[PDB]
Ligand binder design. Structure first.
Ligand SMILES: CC(=O)Nc1ccc2ccn(-c3cc(NC4CC4)n4ncc(C#N)c4n3)c2c1
Length: 326
């Protein structure tokens, strides 16, 4: 069987908490009053919800309402408990209310989000460093609180650019970290899935989020969205291997005694590790620095144990100007 793994940091944060902190199956949902909100317009669909802008008629606040499609009680309880545990944490979306009427609806703080397809193409070198640092504050916080996001991606990072305001949203896939637990690998968007998910290594941890973050950083500095563009989950690992190289991949598989799907055998092939420089062009060079590439290299690792922690990432030279300015 596969060799076990433990998070390097925040390993036992939940084991030290009272049971109720992480035992979300026992959680009793506190329902607010549905009549306090009126929907204004549809914002879009998720996997298991439709999202609206609304008004709290009680206080004239703009809010966001996520009306749940049918999902198991325990999955709703998990997201609620996590949002409550993290509330007040840096750049974590605030869950403001939970209502019903027999469908449950989560009510969030509204972020005046700048279009992800527009905003990203205006960002300067400084902006990317600044917003990356803001995401790292949210990830260090949630990790320190015993929670993996497991769905870090551009769509789940709301930025009100005028106010330099960022929030990490959509904690619907997040889970509590418990050492030894075998997690579901069927999480995250294709392009952002960590190698652990793609090879079916279940004993993963907070470090998953750091891979996803590295994918975001690469797509921003190189202006290549998505960065790792797979055709499916199998081809996704191939796309990663054509950049990181196959030697390190097979080293990771050996170290954890992972059983690789036989399918993969015929498709991974043999690939050198590429230098980052092949992704730099006249369009993106203003975003790309030695610091950026050093930081990126230390997030995008097969071996989850070798990736930077959120807290370590915050100390990287890439952020020195940002840290001084704050
Ligand atoms: C709520 C959730 O987890 N899922 C989700 C899924 C789809 C959409 C589509 C739009 N949203 C938004 C749009 C904006 N702001 C307005 C300017 C566009 N915000 N501001 C704050 C949240 C939250 N939470 C939000 N959500 C979604 C959220």
């Amino acid at each position: 069987g596969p060799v076990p793994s433990r998070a390097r940091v925040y390993t036992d944060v939940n084991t030290h908490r009272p049971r109720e902190y992480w035992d979300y199956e026992s959680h009793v949902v506190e329902w607010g009053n549905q009549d306090d909100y009126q929907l204004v317009r549809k914002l879009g669909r998720g996997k298991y919800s439709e999202v609206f802008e609304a008004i709290n008629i009680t206080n004239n606040e703009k809010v966001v309402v996520k009306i749940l499609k049918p999902v198991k009680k325990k999955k709703i309880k998990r997201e609620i408990k996590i949002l409550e545990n993290l509330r007040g944490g840096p750049n974590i979306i605030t869950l403001a209310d939970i209502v019903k009427d027999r469908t449950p609806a989560l009510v969030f703080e509204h972020v005046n989000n700048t279009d992800f397809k527009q905003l990203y193409q205006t960002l300067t070198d400084y902006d990317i460093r600044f917003y990356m640092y803001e995401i790292l504050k949210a990830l260090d916080y949630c990790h320190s609180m015993g929670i993996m996001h497991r769905d870090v991606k551009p769509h789940n990072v709301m930025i009100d650019h005028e106010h330099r305001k960022l929030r990490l949203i959509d904690w619907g896939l997040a889970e509590f970290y418990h050492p030894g637990q075998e997690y579901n690998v069927r999480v995250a968007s294709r392009y952002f899935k960590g190698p652990e998910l793609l090879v079916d290594y279940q004993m993963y941890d907070y470090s998953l989020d750091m891979w996803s973050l590295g994918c975001m950083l690469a797509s921003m500095i190189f202006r290549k969205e998505p960065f790792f563009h797979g055709h499916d989950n199998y081809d996704q690992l191939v796309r990663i291997a054509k950049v990181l190289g196959t030697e390190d991949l097979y080293d990771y598989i050996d170290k954890y005694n992972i059983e690789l799907d036989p399918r993969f055998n015929d498709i991974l092939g043999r690939h050198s590790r590429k230098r980052w420089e092949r992704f730099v062009h006249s369009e993106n060079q203003h975003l790309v620095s030695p610091e950026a590439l050093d930081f990126l290299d230390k997030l995008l690792r097969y071996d989850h144990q070798s990736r930077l922690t959120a807290r370590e990432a915050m100390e990287h030279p890439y952020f020195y100007t940002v840290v001084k300015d704050q």
